[PDB]
Design a protein around this ligand. Structure first.
Ligand SMILES: O=C(O)CCCCCCCCCCOC(=O)S
Ligand SMILES: O=C(O)CCCCCCCCCCOC(=O)S
Ligand SMILES: *SCCCCCCCCCC
Ligand SMILES: *SCCCCCCCCCC
Lengths: 334, 334
């Protein structure tokens, strides 16, 4: 006869700021075409990618994540002392343990703060932004870091005619906290674990670890399957996300799909019936596919180029590995 | 100027059931005393562990989590079609991508429900329980599975002498959903990234992949440092947990700390100042340390022995790698 107490946070939460960090090494298509039988033009028309960034040998998903946070914090007018938790979303923290979240908190100056690694393929940001919003409104935190980071280079098979020109590096973090107006709509999510092997690590670490001198694992992609699924299934995912926020297709100002493939995104923009003048993220051009980091990296780009304004109503749609998606309507940060 | 929908879910949320799964191969202390010369008594005196369970080769974290859910659903008298999401917490899913969750989802027949993998070491489950509860109170999901799964087996160095006897395999899933009574307390969580190296994979997979002629990675433990940290710092954490749930230490009926080491958990009990008759989870004896899976496996055991009853007021304390910790006051399920 003693009811467990419940706590409560803020009603309205929003993206206070975005920070982005891309490693300085520019990898061209022609440099990629080195061990590939295709050209710059073939790669740009089929994907929309021109150049992408590769990290340094000493760099890691965590170090870039630490770096993205600082910048977001700086853009937020906030210190590490003002943060209550940090979620790292990544698919390329190359340790089973420890998780990257503590390390990032540690180097940021706030070693004691709550946090975890959330891994859900390319869709990892939608879930982690979703988890923050709910935790903050829940009262477990007031202000929170959600960082997407990905070191994909070391996982690329440079002879792989189907995916080498695709994956890249970068880290972008957002600051989530209380806001006057409601800023982040309901998370709309789900998956398709039937197609789990569409984007995968071909060999598992333990099997590989039993015969290290045999073929090592790489990232593999059954592209047409991914094209079909994404191109035809995310339209509703976007509609469900807009519906839960109480908004209309013609009300979206910025559209931030996962930067997987520009032809896919072209089909979604048309399927989503947005305004003819809706600003549509195209960070694919000089960032490539950065999985968990893709969307917040895309957001920053548009804010930096001034194509998007802070406070613009925006739709987010994450899609990729596991075959799992996540989508939310948000105001633009910064 | 368009508004974003402010939505609500159910306020009161609890653990409906718990479903555990344990590998049939019983590996003993004297069996671990064939490679490396210690003693079954030495291990028992120092850790509290007598035997442990190692999973089969055709078994995995992913596979064991699926079976635990089958059982969690079975004990709540429910169906995969009643579940809106799964959270697989783990440290031994031996793929960067795809996530375990969607696979676990499809194998239960839950077509494309939301789901992600949460990593925060031994404390992953406390984090996962708290995240799910957040999502239901926000309205993102109604009923959810949360599964700590682990196959630490293949990660153990048989020459360890410091931790070969510590780690073991298993899974345990809880169903989280609406209840009339508030069943899960506010999440008390945190970390210590300065001490990230205390429990770590010693070599990263890329580095190892890059150098197959060198040593393979293994799980490493800095015992003394972990003992010092967990046994003197975790009292305050539980104290913070009980404070948030509005309960006095003498109101606790069951204590389920992470099954790291009996001697640690022994000192915890005294610092925590619970009742003399308070039920203390000792699953460690024939289970060992199962990271993420530990606590819900430790829950299931107390319910199986009848040492704990459904509705009992439990104090959970997860702690370990990342040097991260998670705690909350709950009601026992089943
Ligand atoms: O037609 C061919 O023979 C090859 C054409 C392949 C280029 C088209 C891009 C691959 C689609 C991958 C999209 O999924 C993700 O980006 S993930
Ligand atoms: O240093 C002390 O006072 C205790 C001696 C260390 C005991 C031997 C190893 C157990 C380490 C504690 C458990 O670590 C985890 O499983 S986490
Ligand atoms: S859509 C997210 C893709 C994530 C790829 C990371 C897996 C790399 C394989 C390791 C060799
Ligand atoms: S909660 C403590 C268990 C740590 C899990 C990591 C397993 C080590 C991987 C080495 C290959």
């Amino acid at each position: 006869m003693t009811e467990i107490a419940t706590t409560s946070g803020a009603r309205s939460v929003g993206l206070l700021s975005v920070g982005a960090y891309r490693p300085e090494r520019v990898v061209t298509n022609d440099e990629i075409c080195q061990h590939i039988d295709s050209s710059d033009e073939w790669i740009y028309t089929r994907t929309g990618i021109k150049t992408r960034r590769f990290a340094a040998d000493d760099e890691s998903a965590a170090s870039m994540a630490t770096e993205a946070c600082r910048r977001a914090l700086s853009n937020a007018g906030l210190s590490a002392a003002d943060i209550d938790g940090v979620i790292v979303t990544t698919n390329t923290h190359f340790l089973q343990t420890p998780p990257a979240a503590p390390m990032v908190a540690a180097s940021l100056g706030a070693k004691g703060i709550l946090g975890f690694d959330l891994s859900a393929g390319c869709a990892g940001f939608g879930y982690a932004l979703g988890a923050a919003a709910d935790m903050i409104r829940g009262g477990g935190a007031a202000t929170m870091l959600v960082v997407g980071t990905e070191k994909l280079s070391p996982t690329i098979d440079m002879y792989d005619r189907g995916n080498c020109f695709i994956f890249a590096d970068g880290a972008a973090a957002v600051v989530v906290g209380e806001t006057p107006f409601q800023g982040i709509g309901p998370t709309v999510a789900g998956s398709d674990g039937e197609q789990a092997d569409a984007i995968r690590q071909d060999i598992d670490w333990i099997t590989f670890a039993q015969n290290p001198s045999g073929p090592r694992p790489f990232v593999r992609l059954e592209g047409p399957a991914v094209f079909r699924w994404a191109a035809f299934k995310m339209g509703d995912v976007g509609r469900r996300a807009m519906d839960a926020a109480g908004v209309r297709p013609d009300q979206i100002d910025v559209f931030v799909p996962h930067q997987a493939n520009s032809r896919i995104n072209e089909l979604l923009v048309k399927n989503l019936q947005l305004r003819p003048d809706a600003v549509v993220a195209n960070d694919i051009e000089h960032t490539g596919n950065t999985s968990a980091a893709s969307i917040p990296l895309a957001m920053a780009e548009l804010l930096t180029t001034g194509a998007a304004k802070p406070g613009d109503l925006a739709l987010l749609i994450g899609y990729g590995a596991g075959l799992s998606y996540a989508a939310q309507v948000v105001r633009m940060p910064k």
